[model samples]
Target: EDVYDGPVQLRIGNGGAGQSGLVKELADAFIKSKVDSGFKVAWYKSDTTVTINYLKDGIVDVGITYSPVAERISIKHGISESPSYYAFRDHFMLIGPPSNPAKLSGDSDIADMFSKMHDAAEAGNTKPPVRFLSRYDKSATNIKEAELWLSIGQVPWATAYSTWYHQYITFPIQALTAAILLREYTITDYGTYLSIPRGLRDQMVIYKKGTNDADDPLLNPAHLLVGARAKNAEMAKEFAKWLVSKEGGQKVIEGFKKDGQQLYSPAPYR
Candidate 1:
């Protein structure tokens, strides 16, 4: 049935961990813009894996996803017929119990820190035997995690080091929550990590900042990809354009913050 009968409503596939904070802010502003009067936007909450899958199958007209996952999709399904627009930049954070078992807090080298954590766990030095709670989902964060392990010539496997390593097919909040219950280490998108109340952390410390500012950059970029076969192509294209426009969504993204601190940096127009 033709549900979008007239006034321009969009079904947007939003990447999520209770919805991406920065992207949510952008979506909120985009929907409220007067330029698109009577124009409405709705969400289909999912992580990058589902988001991209739905995108390929034409379930949503426009979508948002992290760059790595989007790149992986392109490799597997072929480049998106609709050009992707780079919208904003966020980052990742490595966190664990305040005890800092591997002494990795404040360390700039991601590979070095992971290797150290791996070695320490094998020696039964960490109080929490499995030092890292991995999100083995085919997510952007997981893709990044896999790259780090591969760079160091290793892969996390239950049998490879069952005592000290474990992976979960869960969202960021679930993975982080699991880490909290077990007092283990985990990497997460800064927005999702920051959205969580401090009290829930149980004194976990964010070991390293993974931003463009960090010596070892872990920039998390968000992109707007309009589905090539979208039924609402015009509105989808307009929304994607607005995502990167200075007076439009980009300005909203630039100003989005959590705890009075910016959660994302709007990418400079190319």
Candidate 2:
């Protein structure tokens, strides 16, 4: 509950925003509180590259990784399971411009809808319209879902244009962009804050090739385990527990809820 020790550098990791939703808020606040206390907690925002580097190099002593990464970490650095559980969940949504001009409604099966849009964009058919969907190609989560559309159409997706969500997610089209401005929606992993239903969000996948599945520190139930290298390992465990504690963190979470959308699922303690 209180700090009386020298600075301890910790690392926290996160994947794309569209996917992580509310859980990332809990994590950010958790790390920031430590930093504000004049302690050290580095937030590592990455897809796969930075995650892998952190793992192999041991550049960061503590971090948040997807659950599956536990296997890899154990192999690399003899990571034993931690004792606290990080309350976690993930979901997928299809995001796009609010208008739904392409007729790509969220209702359809995720794969089929993307194919129609891809074909229309490729052929330049605007009547029923297939518009370009901006996305990150490097991400297996994004590309993997897009590939499903390709299979549905049975032809290469040459017609629809492609774009990045970073470039087009905001209005006034933040930067220089080619291929005519189109909408950016993250169906597979990104959250659609505008068009989402009552409880569902745009991000939360258990294990895709490019995320915490490959690296565990992003998140794991094993965070509850004690670290062998930890000095006064018992207290370290105690500190981690208190950090996520409702008494310590409730106010922080309430404050974050006011910032934008509330990200945490209804927890038992809450």
Give the winner by TM-score.
1
Cα lDDT tens digits, model 1, 46-137, are 66666666667878776677765464565456434446788777788788887777767474587788888877877775555647777887
Global lDDT of each model? 0.70, 0.40
Tens digits of per-residue lDDT for model 2, 183-266:
333334322332334323223121111123422211122122223453334443544564457754444434444226443322
TM-score of each: 0.83, 0.51
Candidate 2 lDDT for residue 73: 57
Tell me how far the alpha carbon of residue 252 in candidate 2 is from the true structure, in angstroms, after superposition. 5.2
lDDT for 231 in candidate 2 is 39
Candidate 2: RMSD to truth: 8.9
Clashing residue pairs in candidate 1 (N, C-alpha, C atoms within 3 angstroms): none
* lDDT of model 1, residue 28: 63
Residue 263 lDDT in candidate 1: 74
